[PDB]
Amino acid sequence: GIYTSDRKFVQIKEMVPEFVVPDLTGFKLKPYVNYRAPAGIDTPLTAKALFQETVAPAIEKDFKEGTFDANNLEKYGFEPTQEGKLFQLYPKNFPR
Amino acid sequence: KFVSWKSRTKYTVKPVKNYRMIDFLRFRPEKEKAPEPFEEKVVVVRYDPCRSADIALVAGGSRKRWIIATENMKAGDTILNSNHIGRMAVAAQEGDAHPLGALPVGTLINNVESEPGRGAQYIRAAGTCGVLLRKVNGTAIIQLPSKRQMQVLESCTATVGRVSNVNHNQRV
Amino acid sequence: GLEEFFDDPKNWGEEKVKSGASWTCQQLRNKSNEDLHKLWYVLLKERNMLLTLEQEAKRQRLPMPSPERLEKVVDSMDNVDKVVQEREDALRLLQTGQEKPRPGAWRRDIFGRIVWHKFKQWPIPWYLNKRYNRRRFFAMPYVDRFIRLRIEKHARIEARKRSLQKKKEKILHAKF
Amino acid sequence: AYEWGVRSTRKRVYEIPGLEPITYEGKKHFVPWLARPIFPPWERGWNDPRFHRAAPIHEQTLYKEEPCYIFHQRCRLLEGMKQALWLTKTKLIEGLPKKVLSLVDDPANHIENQEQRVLDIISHARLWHSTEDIPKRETYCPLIVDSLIQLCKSQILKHPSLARRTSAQNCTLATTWNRESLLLQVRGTSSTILSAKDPLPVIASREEVEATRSHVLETFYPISPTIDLQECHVYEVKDDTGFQEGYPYPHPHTLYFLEKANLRPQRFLPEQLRAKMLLFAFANALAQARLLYGNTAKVLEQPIVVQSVGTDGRVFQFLVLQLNTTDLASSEGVKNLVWTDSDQLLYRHFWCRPVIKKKVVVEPVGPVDFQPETFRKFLALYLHGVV
Amino acid sequence: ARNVLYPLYQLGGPQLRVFRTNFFIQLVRPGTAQPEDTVQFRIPMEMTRVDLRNYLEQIYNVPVAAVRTRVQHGSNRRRDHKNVRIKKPDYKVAYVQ
Amino acid sequence: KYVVHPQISALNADRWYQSFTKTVFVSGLPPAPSLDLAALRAAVCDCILQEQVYVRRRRPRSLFDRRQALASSILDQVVRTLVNLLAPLNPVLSTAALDCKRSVDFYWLRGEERIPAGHRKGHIDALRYQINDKPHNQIRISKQLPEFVPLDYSIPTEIPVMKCKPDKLPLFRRQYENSIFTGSKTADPCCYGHTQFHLIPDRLKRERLIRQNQAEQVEAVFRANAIASLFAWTGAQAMYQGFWSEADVTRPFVSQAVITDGKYFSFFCYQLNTLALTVQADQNNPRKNLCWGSQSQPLYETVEDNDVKGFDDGTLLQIVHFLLNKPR
RNA sequence: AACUAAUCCUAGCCCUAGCCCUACAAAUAUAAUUAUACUAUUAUAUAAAUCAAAACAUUUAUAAAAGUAUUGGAGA
RNA sequence: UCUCCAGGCAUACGCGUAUAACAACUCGGAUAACCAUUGUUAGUUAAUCAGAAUAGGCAAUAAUCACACUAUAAAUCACCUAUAACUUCUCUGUUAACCCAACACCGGAAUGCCUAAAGGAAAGAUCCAAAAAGAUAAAAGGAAAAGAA
RNA sequence: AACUGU
């Protein structure tokens, strides 16, 4: 909130966080995992991996067809600006 | 980072937390008047904490302003402030502000200004009186308390009479 | 629910509670973005219940049954956070190329050291922010003497380190 | 020494054409070794009231070259009574209206144990009301007047016609009129307005109203009539009776104005209070005439009578005003008739604690030199127009 | 969420939403004698009483009538073998009806 | 000593206050000249409801007090007119004294506690309570009101009992002057009173309370304010007569009060039977204080144009019925 | 043969050699470590003296030629 | 329960867990009992108690129960006119027999209320030494009472 | 002078 004149507290609804609680009904993931389940080797996701998985197939097909141009870079997923999104990648304007 | 304590936005005659704002430009044309001679009334002779001499409240028209008190100022006295240079001798009431041209030679004066419009800066202390040593045309000689005799234009404003506490110089 | 804050009534009084292995990072990566957010709360709920039980145990001056459960949940939660962070980090780099979510730059302090300064968001610009301008990002002339001392101190640290190793080496020769 | 000018103040690379000097704007922070950047005006993206600045008066759309002089509660007239008469174009008759005096002559008007009840009310209003040993005028002054009105309001038993009037709160009165080409505005608010369904009886006949033409407003040259008024260049023309149109009690019976300041320097002088009452009472009367007869300027065939009472809890001032003309542009002609009764003391002094001198109770806890006549004069105004 | 930066709010800005919560709370048997409906909770010092109200209402669907909270000073009298004062972590006790 | 607020948001505050006061609250009103009720449906001054649209006043700067300020203006005007209108029928109103926003104070002791720690650990001290109230309006008369039930009247209902300490419910003790006040000093002839008027703040109004989930507490706020205000006010009156803890009242002291939320109106009646509330003074006392209260009821529905629609005479009749009551 | 005590070797260091150097979150110069506006923001003149001249005053160091010559209260 | 003594309670400031319960008997109290010690756990709950927009216009007349009444040491923003904003209760303080004096130092320590209903204990035991200190009593006498200069 | 174990 914000303290206005006269030493009076004025709570701001926007600045008050709202807890987004997921629905756990039908969700099969639980706090613990089976010892029967093999441990997973860590393979952290990277920009190259994300680009290869999603963006590369689109460009590869388009490039062979020849329908590739700078103006359509956004079509493959480029964002000219982070404004307009509730969650902005940079500068980070959203909380966890 | 230094700000003077005399920082009141509005000039007032009420004591200020007390200090009373004094006015040393005697002929300041008052509201609802032309830049012509105007008269004022000495409402009260009060005590000034920040000055040795006692200040007399002089009121005229719609404006009330504190001024330094001369030797014989008392409550209810009439004070005239004139810019016009009288062709003949102008009626002299102690404490009145008149051009040196109007006054005759030999009249005790105080709250004189070295240059016209400068404002009262000398003969403001208790018992200090300036003697009009000489008068010629538009020039007059005013003796300041420092013993410096200076020649100034007749337009310079001088207040008749000695300052209050006439025996300040005679203090033992 | 209130019951979720506490362990199963059947498990009460048991020496331990049977629980499996914690979530590994790769399995969480396989799970969807929505699933990851759902799982985080599930782990958090278990963590709070285990924390709730542990605090009561401290009040009762009693041991916590199966303390490894809390460690497993925390490990799973830690794995979840990095997996989600990895996806967010990758996309930010792709769209913007910035290696850090928060704007920053290298700045020199009054001591002459070069440190990464994390930028702060303000409603006013820097030039109109006197307090931000009041903050000192410039090194004084006298820091040159300190800079020489820092280089000398670094050399002194290496010299002292060799002396420390020498004393250890003495016993190695004596022992062997 | 008188100082002209605030005493506080008293004891290359850019020039190159075609090139731009480097500045620490890129650094994003000040450094003494770099040139000061040139910053264009900053845009916040929204308006902050804390950092907002009011636009100048002249830029305002409502700005008008002619000055509108507005009179409010704090305004103190230099000439006092004389200025008010000139501004309101009214003729003054000393004393209350002949009718008002006759109201209390009737024995039925006098309250049973009127003096004792007033004495009890005065003691209650001053001492018994609060637990404080010596309550201040800021508290008892509103209370005493309210208690007196209730006692007067209790007379409905004797006169059922009194049920046709009621008192409102924080009524705002305002009017705009011209005097000898001078724009004048009076703003009055606060206090209470007693309103009745019927207009107060006219005190002066039409022949007397015409006789007012002989009277001439006194002048005080060279001081302007606008002295002591708030000179306004941004203003709107408004007429206010204290109520919106449709009020079932359109006629104001009395206009009260209380001065509860404890300290005499904080209290307006008796002359100033009456001068304030005259302008405020005139404005309320003028608003009624303008609403009834429109904005046209003419002599009123049916005069409007309104009353005003001003008291500080110890001194009571009674004012009765009759509006005879709306043609106030000229200073000569039919003039409004006003009746003034001033310096009516309910009591000379009151002791809120017993005064014991030499182990003798010289003064009790009660009013000193209590005058029941003042309440009778107040009672006369309240009952006027009904009995 | 604790130990994190919260977005600065400006006029017309979005409502603040916390999709992932780092606040962890513990239900504790009341040390003092309290009404049965009243419940004591140990919560991070950075959490507000309003946050607890939303936290219980949303995450655990618990209806709350009134909340009273206190901050317990951690004793720093304890010293280690080196005579260095040890400070107990400060914790906040919340009384929720 | 504990500081007691007549208007408080604590749960079951009326029950807690009753335990501190030894008052039993029976639901409903206490056991028991034509004036054109229709004329009073409008003589009650919908005119001030008409004037709130006509009477021009400077706008409040806050913009939040506008609603609350409006309620105060109408209530004050309605009270003034009602006293005058009902004066001819009931002579008591003629001699009555009207108090506006004045303070009523009472200081009483009930129970005891053992100091848990400190230099005085283990010492026995009494539980001190103070009630300070400023009713919107109250009527003070020179003659006691007629009793609604004979003194020593006994009913099977039991006074509330509080398991926990007073501090556990939000309550704080402070050391200051102890005051017992009837709304005026003893010198005032009107040592008794007719009715008390209270206005609930916006924070405790029904709409906010329902949103806050404390819908059931709406009646509790009415009861807590009524019991605290009436008991403290009644207790001061008895003390003015010389009755204190060791000299219990020989005659029952009765009073009534009305609490309104701005639209709904509630009526409460209190009878004071015991001044001995200390453990020593109340060690063997069979008498108890009795309070009768009624549910809050709307006085109207809305006020559009320049008139009031939906005015409920029944609430006004209770005011008329209450005002017409006089001692026998 | 008893008490109080004593017993010990690594804790580490020193000098040359070698070598220049380029080693979490959150909060912070405002009141440092205070998540957003206030208030503009800023070091440093010969180094001297002490000291030696038994005090003190000009003065007083900081490869061979060679401690040769000059200089110097011709004295340290 | 008895005998006797008579600055007590709140706040400020400072202190910072010395608070409370349990468990210990080594160390701390200049001795015990018991803890102020040692270990562990608990604690102080506030919409009411406390802390954390702008531009113009305009002001003569102390207080003292403020009336009379004087005096001298000379003693008080408001409200108008415009502009801007548009629905609010979070955060923090709350324990104690406590502080400044190296010490559990016969010292220092602000304000409000009240003067016992609040708050306290001079006696480790024995003996009745001398000598010494303090207090009380004096036959006759009065420098060997409170009066004068 | 009185007063008192001076």
DSSP conformation letters of D235-271: -----EESS-TT-S--EEEEEEEE---SSTTTS--HH
Tell me how far CA of residue B128 lies from CA of B26, B70, B143, D358, in angstroms. 18, 9, 10, 54
Helix axes D114-123, D137-153, angle to 10 degrees: 150
Q: CA nearest D31 in C: which residue?
A: C138
Nearest 5°: the CA angle B147, B149, B151 is 160
In this structure, which amino acid lies at residue E39?
Answer: V
Within E 69-88, residues with CB less than 7 Å from strand H: 69-73, 75-78, 85
Among C30, C46, C96, pick the best mutation site for testing chain A contact (most A Cβ within 10 A): C96
Q: CA nearest D49 in E: which residue?
A: E11
Using CB atoms, pick whichever of C24, C31, C35 lies closest to residue A39: C24
What is the 3 state secondary structure string of C86-130? HHHHHHHHHHHCCCCCCCEEEEECCCCCEEEEECCCCCCCCCCCH
F59 touching chain E per CB within 8 A:
no
Cα gap C81→D129, rounded to integer Å: 69
A41 touching chain C per CB within 8 A:
yes
Residue F2 Cα to chain centre, angstroms:
20
C-alpha atoms less than 13 angstroms from C-alpha of D53 in its C-beta half-sphere: 2
Contact D284, D241 (CB under 8 A): yes
Residues of D in contact with B62 (CB under 8 A): 78, 223, 227-228
Cα gap D164→C157, rounded to integer Å: 101
Cα gap F321→F323, rounded to integer Å: 6
D231 touches strand H (CB under 7 A): yes
- For chain F, the straight-line distance linking the first and the last C-alpha, in angstroms and rounded, comes to 40
Strand, helix or coil for residue F45: coil
Contact F136, F98 (CB under 8 A): no
Within E 25-44, residues with CB less than 7 Å from strand H: 28, 30-32, 34, 40
Residue B43 Cα to chain centre, angstroms:
16
A19 touching chain C per CB within 8 A:
no
What is the pairing mode between strands F23-27 and F289-293? parallel
Strand, helix or coil for residue D150: helix
Tell me how far CA of residue C145 lies from CA of C115, C139, C142, E55, in angstroms. 19, 12, 6, 55
Cα gap B40→B57, rounded to integer Å: 10
F88 touching chain D per CB within 8 A:
yes
E89 touches strand H (CB under 7 A): no
Contact E55, E23 (CB under 8 A): yes
Using CB atoms, pick whichever of C40, C54, C102 lies closest to residue E20: C40
E11: left (phi over 0), alpha (psi -120 to 50) or beta: beta
Which two structure tokens, joined as six digits, stand for F314?
Answer: 């029944």
- C71, C90, D323: which is closest to A52 by C-alpha? C90
Q: Per-residue b/e over F32-50, b at no fewer than 16 CB within 10 Å?
A: eeeeeeeebbebbbbbbbb
Cα gap F238→F256, rounded to integer Å: 15
Strand, helix or coil for residue D9: helix
Within F 221-250, residues with CB less than 7 Å from strand H: none
Cα gap D369→D347, rounded to integer Å: 5
Across-strand partners of D196? D165, D251
Nearest 5°: the CA angle C87, C92, C97 is 135
What ranges in D113-172 are assigned the alpha helix state H?
114-123, 137-153
Taking residue B5's Cβ as centre, other Cβ atoms within 10 Å add up to 9
C-alpha atoms less than 13 angstroms from C-alpha of C8 in its C-beta half-sphere: 7
F63 touches strand H (CB under 7 A): yes
In this structure, which amino acid lies at residue D44?
Answer: R
Contact F105, F180 (CB under 8 A): yes
Cα gap D88→D277, rounded to integer Å: 11
- Interface A-E: count of C-beta contacts within 8 A: 54
Which two structure tokens, joined as six digits, stand for F50?
Answer: 């008409």
What ranges in chain F are assigned the alpha helix state H?
13-21, 37-43, 46-54, 65-86, 91-95, 206-211, 217-240, 313-324
Q: What is the DSSP string of F165-179?
A: -TTTTT--B------
Strand, helix or coil for residue C147: helix
> Which residues of D sit within 8 Å Cβ distance of F?
120, 123-124, 127-131, 146, 150, 153-154, 156-157, 163, 166-172, 189, 240, 242-249, 365
Among D27, D28, D36, pick the best mutation site for testing chain C contact (most C Cβ within 10 A): D28
**Contact yes or no, E with F (3+ CB pairs under 8 Å):** yes
- The residues, any chain, with a CB within 8 Å of residue C157's CB and separated by 6 or more, are none
Q: Which residue is nearest to nucleotide G22 (CA to C1')?
A: C151
Strand, helix or coil for residue D160: helix
Which two structure tokens, joined as six digits, stand for C117?
Answer: 């300064």
Cα gap F243→F260, rounded to integer Å: 32
In this structure, which amino acid lies at residue F306?
Answer: N
Q: Which of residues 34-63 of D touch C (CB under 8 A)?
A: 37, 39, 42, 44
Nucleotide whose C1' lies closest to the alpha carbon of residue C101: G25
What's chain C's Rg over C-alpha atoms? 27
Contact F145, F192 (CB under 8 A): yes
Residues of C in contact with E42 (CB under 8 A): 55
* Residue D65 CB burial class (10 angstroms; 0-12, 13-18, ≥19): exposed
Header resolution in angstroms: 4.6
E17 touching chain A per CB within 8 A:
yes
F163 touching chain E per CB within 8 A:
yes
At residue D211, φ and ψ (nearest 5 deg) are: -65, -25
Q: Which method was it determined by?
A: cryo-EM
E14 touching chain A per CB within 8 A:
yes
Contact F272, F296 (CB under 8 A): no
C-alpha atoms less than 13 angstroms from C-alpha of C78 in its C-beta half-sphere: 7
Q: CA nearest B3 in D: which residue?
A: D8
Give the torsion sign (CA, D153, D156, D158, D161): positive
What ranges in chain D are assigned the alpha helix state H?
81-88, 98-105, 114-123, 137-153, 206-211, 270-293, 372-383
Closest Cα of chain C to E57: distance in Å?
10
Across-strand partners of A82? none
